[PDB]
A paper describes a structure:
Rhodotorula dairenensis β-fructofuranosidase is a highly glycosylated enzyme with broad substrate specificity that catalyzes the synthesis of 6-kestose and a mixture of the three series of fructooligosaccharides (FOS), fructosylating a variety of carbohydrates and other molecules as alditols. RdINV subunit is composed of two domains, similar to the rest of the reported fungal β-fructofuranosidases within GH32. The β-propeller catalytic domain contains residues 185 to 487 and is constituted by five blades (I-V), each involving four antiparallel β-strands (ABCD) with a “W” topology. The β-sandwich domain, extending from residue 495 to 673, is composed of twelve β-sheets ordered in two six-stranded clusters of antiparallel β-strands.
To analyze its hydrolytic activity, the inactivated D188A-RdINVΔ21–139 mutant was deglycosylated, crystallized and used for soaking experiments with different sugars, including fructose, sucrose, 1-kestose, raffinose or nystose, and, also, ternary complexes with fructose and palatinose, trehalose or hydroxytyrosol have also been pursued. However, only complexes of this truncated variant with fructose, sucrose or raffinose were obtained, the crystals belonging to the P21 space group with two complete dimers within the asymmetric unit that are essentially similar. To obtain D188A-RdINVΔ21–139 fructose complex, crystals were grown in 18% PEG 3350, 0.2 M MgCl2, 0.1 M Bis-Tris pH 5.5 solution (1:1 rate) in the presence of 20 mM fructose. Diffraction data of D188A-RdINVΔ21–139 in complex with fructose, sucrose and raffinose were collected at the ALBA synchrotron station (Barcelona, Spain), being indexed in the P21 space group with four molecules in the asymmetric unit, at 1.86 Å, 2.38 Å and 2.27 Å, respectively. The crystal complexes show clear electron density at the active site that allows unambiguous ligand modeling. Remarkably, a net of well-ordered water molecules is found in all complexes, contributing to substrate binding. Moreover, the Bis-Tris molecule shows one of its hydroxyl groups very close to the fructose and, thus, is in a proper position to act as an acceptor substrate in a putative transfructosylating reaction. This is consistent with and illustrates the previously reported fructose transference activity on various polyols.
Numbering used by the authors:
A (entry chain A), B (entry chain B): 142 to 556, 562 to 672
The structure:
């Protein structure tokens, strides 16, 4: 059986009224439907919201959700739960607008076990959502509380809790700092993150502004102010302001950027005036960090799309638009020359890793790996390359031809051009030394070639040699992680024919180079 | 009849020894050879150097030049002169390395009419070049002087004039401030522009550092610190620090960025912590400003290429690699919401503008313009759109379909895919409101499709409606300028078949919208 390219009418037909108190049933069998990423059972999804872990260890993912269309609008908070951030259970819609002319825009959630809010006289498991209500004339911050573990929310009786009389004032991210609540919120079209403080989540006082930092684009969105541990030393950490911008990103549309710095409970001060882009492709946006994580883990998830084409991608015939990124483990590190770097790695994938397709220690060879018998149409790969120390001390010893080439090739079973669906090319030396290209050839996709914003080629240039590469392919998405997650990219692909194999080639590698390649099929979560 | 795709052996064969005191003869007839842009007669060119206007109105363009190969190396300063920045005369090589193991890297030139240097006891027309000398172990700043108008240079007897014992210290840009010389120079791998002062161009004193601003990439290069007049008010100006970075640009490889701010003769202070990219495509790098211009004119030129593919472009069979951008008139303006903006417009094109190919006032139409009779294979176009007052006040009145689509189509006489060589698509509203796409379809170019770094699609998103668009096509290059040069892009194209025509379509425009389209052929300067 080939995965279907179109579904039954009952799978794709959207209701004319929003379902309340019942799970929306999903057909997750589409040829483009990711099997280890979250996507909504039906309809259009964007930013992750309300991300938190409850005391029982359940991760709550909420999401911007149009239950009525395959385009942006009518925003509700959708809800899915998981104990491992891969095996998702769909839940009833969590937050509804008060009427048909208002929308529940992005926001965050916190546990209030000490009842600072006063909402929780008889429970230590209270959840508070802080979110933007979009009116035709205003964006205001509102509060809603849950006594049932974050499934049903009661709006605060004296909403809204915060307004500045603006229709560009959104995406509150709330967290506890020592003795008070902090809110980071975007004065979106003023390129300002405003910081407010509160003892009880309902009374907010202005603290400070963070304005005109890094790339402006056309708006600041979905600010996250978080403490991120050092990759090489868990006992150390720094504060990080993460800001999403859209439109006006360098590659077009939407992108995330970050600022390492100091936070003292009222003011964030960046360590320098540099701009730093989080992902070197164009399908990673609106990253939100999970509240109430265990063991000083920095855990985030993003929307794996771009505002320039998210409402036009050819998945609506498969009963959805938009998926989340892999869930991410985050660290800070210093990389050679550039210094500060936001590290992103896939959150523990062990619960979805299936049997080995290939284990190889062959250097200067091509490994040809078929996965047509992997029903998920999803694979994980790991490539380690360890140069001899002679080639580290003297890079002039490396051949101009020393390179890595990865290609994802169309299925022989589920066919059509022979073009790869996705390529990665890296050079150790030569005229483009350290250059890594990630491509989705226009030739592989009639839709992609025609969409004016669907960029074919992305690149990042290393200073250090490439020593590790991890990747996940999941039907219509490729994520890559270079040098223990120092550099990462999230890339959508919509090939005319589904991918059925991958080739991993190394060439021109120095004598004594160690190569280790591992490829595993992934098990579907649905 | 058709422009040659391959030239005689004598046209492309490079000498084995560098010619001294003689002009290198060029064949400028190649199907990819620009006819209104500067490119070297033979060999490989990169960054513009020594840019200045002499007292008699001759513009001097020097350039990084490998006379021996079609790749980077063996750097000399090549030299060309013009009175209008379009009609270039090739000159003998201006600056030579002192031996076979050193290279003349980038730098600047200034007039020294008051003989501050002591080089010019008997002339007020003295020119001083300040440039990086590259050795395998060091980058140092050197001085050479010319008494003959900048054709022949004598090295300063006590070179070098500035060393810090670094191998990453280059691209000095020198200018007069009130009572002293200022040098902006890149501590390239430290992401620092160092400012030095001198009474006499030979003795340099450290003044200040400008460090870790905007995008770092992998290196700061070719800093320019210049006073740029306001577009709306010639009597006002602000200081601007322009920095080129490579590699590590968001689109891959090389890009220019800028910082508006204050300069007081010793210290540059940016007005804010924002990063601002100069050009929204990937083929505009190492912009240098002309010294000693007239009438408060800010004039610059850039290298129209990208380091990721400049040494691989398919023009070596046509006796060259690399062209300059159009010469640019620069201003600063405030654009809606985003604020500070570097304006770039083509410098007075009137000396190359040939007869009209089309004048049209038709809205909601497709104009087909054939230019197979324009021997230059170069055209200028101008498109104005004036929306009615009603739609300027209420944009909700604009149709989702309101759009402008320009395509450059392959010649049928000199061919074959029917793919456009280049496209521009802009939307007034709909789901991607204000989004402008500039594309070079992979389908149009076998070389382009295969090159892993030759990105197919670029975009910029407007806030204001598009009201003006100017463009120049020149055989293998397209430059576009949006809303009186508020936004600009430089894009190389290497189509399999030469461009023979363009289509300009408007559609879905509000009742009462005024459209004016002008297209002119350009006259070859060679
Ligand atoms: C913390 O930051 C917030 C967000 O930036 C800030 O609130 C804002 O203040 C600015 C003023 O600095 C407001 O901007 C103005 O809004 C009015 C109404 O639309 C405009 O008429 C003003 O126009 C003039 O000034 C502009 C900027 O120089 C010019 O471009 C223009 O031509 C006019 O001369 C101006 O745009 C803005 O509306 C608010 N935004 C919000 C969301 O409140 C707040 O003041 C900061 N607080 C502290 C303590 O610093
Ligand atoms: C102005 O900026 C320049 C350039 O950044 C400063 O010089 C530089 O100083 C740094 C130290 O901050 C040097 O880094 C160092 O590298 C050497 C060798 O790798 C190492 O031994 C040192 O311990 C240090 O890590 C850098 O090399 C150097 N660069 C250059 C081009 O000289 C300068 O100090 C600044 N001046 C002021 C007043 O701030
Ligand atoms: C762009 O707008 C800014 C902010 O309005 C201008 O900067 C100021 O200009 C006024 C004079 O009109 C000065 O008094 C202020 O001190 C300036 N700075 C600030 C932060 O307000 C700037 O001049 C404008 N630039 C252009 C090119 O128009
Ligand atoms: C809909 O709800 C919004 C937000 O509470 C409010 O501003 C608006 O007046 C409501 N309209 C109606 C008629 O219910
Ligand atoms: C929250 O605290 C503020 C003081 O910051 C107080 O004015 C307000 O009454 C409190 N609200 C509730 C509902 O307890
Ligand atoms: C935090 O730092 C700022 C200066 O950046 C200072 O003004 C403020 O008072 C500090 N707040 C606390 C709680 O110390
Ligand atoms: C990066 O280096 C800087 C300068 O030494 C240091 O202050 C910072 O703690 C380092 N960060 C990490 C993550 O190692
Ligand atoms: C499935 O495919 C893999 C990779 O080609 C192969 O190693 C494995 O033996 C196959 N298994 C079956 C049961 O076909
Ligand atoms: C690398 O080897 C070359 C000779 O092959 C030598 O000239 C050079 O100095 C060496 N470089 C280093 C970093 O040791
Ligand atoms: C590859 O190197 C990584 C470091 O990024 C390490 O965690 C992993 O165990 C190695 N994989 C193997 C041995 O193939
Ligand atoms: C990888 O592909 C590139 C194409 O740019 C090629 O130049 C390089 O030699 C190849 N390396 C391999 C097959 O390992
Ligand atoms: C890989 O090829 C390079 C360059 O030809 C060579 O020096 C090296 O010994 C080769 N290694 C293997 C494992 O064949
Ligand atoms: C070559 O010339 C440069 C610049 O004058 C000088 O620094 C270098 O030492 C010279 N090398 C030799 C081998 O003559
Ligand atoms: C340049 O000026 C410095 C400082 O006054 C002085 O030491 C030096 O002799 C001058 N050099 C020349 C060649 O005039
Ligand atoms: C220039 O400005 C800096 C502050 O940015 C100051 O330290 C210096 O004294 C000023 N120099 C002059 C010549 O005024
Ligand atoms: C467009 O408008 C400008 C306004 O200055 C005018 O100079 C120019 O002639 C017009 N260009 C076209 C499209 O005719
Ligand atoms: C331009 O192209 C877009 C699709 O990219 C299309 O929707 C629009 O209707 C076209 N408009 C014109 C003016 O041809
Ligand atoms: C353009 O076409 C639209 C849709 O048919 C129409 O409403 C509008 O009046 C037309 N405008 C002009 C300027 O012809
Ligand atoms: O994509 C992020 C942006 O879109 C929204 O989520 C609305 O669905 C906003 O709250 C946010 O600024
Ligand atoms: O392209 C810019 C860079 O390349 C050089 O011009 C050398 O040819 C350097 O001077 C500069 O940093
Ligand atoms: C969906 O699309 C595939 C090919 O893309 C067809 O094979 C299938 O029948 C359906 O139309
Ligand atoms: C659900 O959506 C699909 C794709 O548009 C339709 O083909 C189907 O009939 C139903 O409307
Ligand atoms: C369940 O109730 C909610 C209340 O907001 C409605 O929006 C929904 O349509 C359904 O009736
Ligand atoms: C330019 O091309 C000619 C052939 O036309 C060669 O002979 C020459 O060496 C250079 O490559
Ligand atoms: C003319 O002289 C220069 C040195 O000034 C040489 O490099 C060139 O080859 C020719 O002899």
């Amino acid at each position: 059986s080939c995965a279907p390219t179109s579904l039954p009418a009952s799978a794709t037909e959207l209701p004319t009224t929003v379902p309340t108190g019942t799970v929306i049933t999903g057909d997750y069998t589409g040829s483009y439907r990711p099997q280890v990423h979250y996507s909504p059972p039906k309809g259009f999804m964007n930013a992750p919201n309300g991300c938190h872990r409850d005391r029982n260890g359940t991760y709550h993912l909420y999401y911007q959700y149009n239950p009525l269309e395959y385009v942006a609008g009518n925003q509700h908070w959708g809800h899915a739960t998981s104990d491992d951030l891969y095996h998702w259970t769909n839940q009833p819609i969590a937050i509804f607008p008060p009427n048909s002319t208002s929308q529940v825009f992005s926001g965050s959630a916190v546990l209030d076990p000490n009842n600072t809010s006063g909402f929780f006289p008889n429970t230590t498991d209270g959840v508070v959502a802080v979110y933007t209500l979009n009116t035709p004339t205003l964006q205001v911050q509102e509060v809603a509380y849950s006594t049932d573990g974050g499934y049903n929310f009661t709006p605060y009786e004296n909403n809204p809790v915060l307004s500045v009389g603006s229709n560009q004032f959104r995406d509150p991210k709330v967290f506890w700092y020592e003795d008070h609540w902090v809110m980071a919120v975007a004065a979106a079209n003023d390129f300002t993150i405003e910081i407010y403080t509160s003892p009880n989540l309902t009374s907010w006082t202005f603290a400070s502004n963070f304005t005109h930092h890094g790339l402006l684009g056309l708006a600041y969105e979905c600010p996250n102010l978080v403490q991120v541990p050092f990759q090489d030393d868990p006992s150390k950490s720094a504060w990080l302001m993460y800001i999403s911008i859209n439109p006006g990103a360098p590659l077009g549309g939407s992108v995330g950027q970050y600022f390492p710095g100091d936070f003292n409970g009222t003011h964030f001060v960046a360590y320098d005036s540099a701009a730093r882009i989080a992902d070197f492709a164009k399908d990673n946006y609106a990253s939100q960090w999970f509240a109430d994580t265990e063991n000083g883990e920095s855990i985030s998830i993003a929307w794996a799309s771009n505002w320039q084409y998210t409402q036009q991608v050819p998945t609506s015939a498969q009963a959805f638009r938009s998926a989340m990124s892999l869930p991410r483990r985050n660290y800070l590190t210093n990389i050679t020359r550039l210094g500060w770097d936001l590290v992103s790695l896939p959150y523990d994938l062990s619960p979805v890793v299936g049997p080995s397709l290939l284990s190889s220690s062959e250097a200067n060879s091509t490994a040809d790996v078929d996965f047509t018998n992997v029903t998920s149409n999803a694979v994980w790969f790991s490539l380690n390359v360890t140069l001899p120390d002679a080639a580290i001390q003297n890079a002039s010893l490396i051949s101009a031809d020393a390179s890595i080439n990865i290609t994802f090739l169309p299925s022989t079973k589920c066919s059509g051009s022979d073009s790869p669906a996705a390529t990665l090319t890296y050079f150790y030396a030569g005229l483009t030394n350290g250059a890594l290209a990630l491509t989705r050839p226009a030739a592989s996709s009639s839709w992609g070639a025609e969409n004016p914003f669907f960029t074919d080629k992305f690149s990042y240039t290393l200073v250090d040699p490439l020593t590790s590469l991890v990747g996940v392919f999941d039907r219509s998405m490729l994520e890559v992680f270079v040098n223990e997650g120092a550099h990462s990219a999230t890339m959508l692909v919509f090939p005319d024919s589904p991918v059925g194999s991958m080739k991993v080639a190394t060439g021109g590698l120095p004598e004594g180079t160690q190569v280790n390649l591992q490829v595993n099929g992934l098990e579907s979560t649905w």
